[PDB]
Amino acid sequence: MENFQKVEKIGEGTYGVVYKARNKLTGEVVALKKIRLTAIREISLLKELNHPNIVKLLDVIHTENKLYLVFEFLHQDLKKFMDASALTGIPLPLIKSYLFQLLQGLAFCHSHRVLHRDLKPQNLLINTEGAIKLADFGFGVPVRTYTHEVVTLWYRAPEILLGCKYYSTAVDIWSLGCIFAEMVTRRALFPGDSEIDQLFRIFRTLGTPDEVVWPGVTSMPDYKPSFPKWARQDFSKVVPPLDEDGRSLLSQMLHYDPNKRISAKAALAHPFFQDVTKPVPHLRL
Numbered sequence: 001m002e003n004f005q006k007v008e009k010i011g012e013g014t015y016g017v018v019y020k021a022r023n024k025l026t027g028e029v030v031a032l033k034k035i036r037l038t039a040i041r042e043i044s045l046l047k048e049l050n051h052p053n054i055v056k057l058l059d060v061i062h063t064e065n066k067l068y069l070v071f072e073f074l075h076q077d078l079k080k081f082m083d084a085s086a087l088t089g090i091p092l093p094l095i096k097s098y099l100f101q102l103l104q105g106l107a108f109c110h111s112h113r114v115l116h117r118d119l120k121p122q123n124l125l126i127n128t129e130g131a132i133k134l135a136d137f138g139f140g141v142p143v144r145t146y147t148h149e150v151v152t153l154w155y156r157a158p159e160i161l162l163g164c165k166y167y168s169t170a171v172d173i174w175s176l177g178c179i180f181a182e183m184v185t186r187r188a189l190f191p192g193d194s195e196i197d198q199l200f201r202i203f204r205t206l207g208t209p210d211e212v213v214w215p216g217v218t219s220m221p222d223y224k225p226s227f228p229k230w231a232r233q234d235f236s237k238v239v240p241p242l243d244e245d246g247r248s249l250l251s252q253m254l255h256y257d258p259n260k261r262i263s264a265k266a267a268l269a270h271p272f273f274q275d276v277t278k279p280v281p282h283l284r285l
């Protein structure tokens, strides 16, 4: 750890602080995550999970009660680029390129039985090259200072909210669907501020789920017959001015039933991507 010089604190999460740092010996600039203290073996698997759309875990440094993760550094995250692009919006061909790349990254994860579990714009890092990468794949002492982030539950799949313990790769598809919608419309799709507010915002848009559209729903841990019964609203009202290929794909990423939800791999074959390209964003570092 003496091999690293802090440049600045980048931010803090629930169980770790992130710094920009310089490797005194490689010359590399890196993002360093510090966690105050199975975990070690699952991190070592993370070291082998290498893909162009996954932030490269360069090193894991266990010292006798801290764990440091050393990542490749990227300058910008999607959350801030969305904020930066709010007045004009992200051009569609860039939206589609970022969506395709995250689908590639997830296709890869998923085929190796790795779930992200917590995708959100602030976890998606971007470079000058038009690349977008998955970061902060989903123990330790809690940072007392961590300040609460409104966006926290906004990307949570409904089966998580309903108490499914043994949820699947489909939760990452749901999250990415929510991100897709938000890029298109420049508004969060389901901006809940508690778990029941998050559930009810979903129900209001997509309709309260029942056995017809989601077999087994009524038997989930936190499901209540007393949930209000909202009617589903038209998708054309939900993400204008997205074209029918886009809306068709989004609809399949947002299926209630985890088993009907489109997989990352099938999503890459969707007609929305027939004309995909790789534009480069205009970033202001």
Ligand SMILES: O=C(NC1CCNCC1)c1n[nH]cc1NC(=O)c1c(Cl)cccc1Cl
Binding pocket: 010, 013, 018, 030, 031, 032, 033, 055, 071, 072, 073, 074, 075, 076, 077, 122, 123, 124, 125, 135, 136
């Ligand atoms: O945070 C980073 N860069 C900042 C983006 C916003 N502008 C300044 C630079 C970064 N660069 N490489 C990796 C990361 N961050 C993460 O991997 C990460 C962790 Cl370790 C924990 C929670 C979220 C994220 Cl994204």
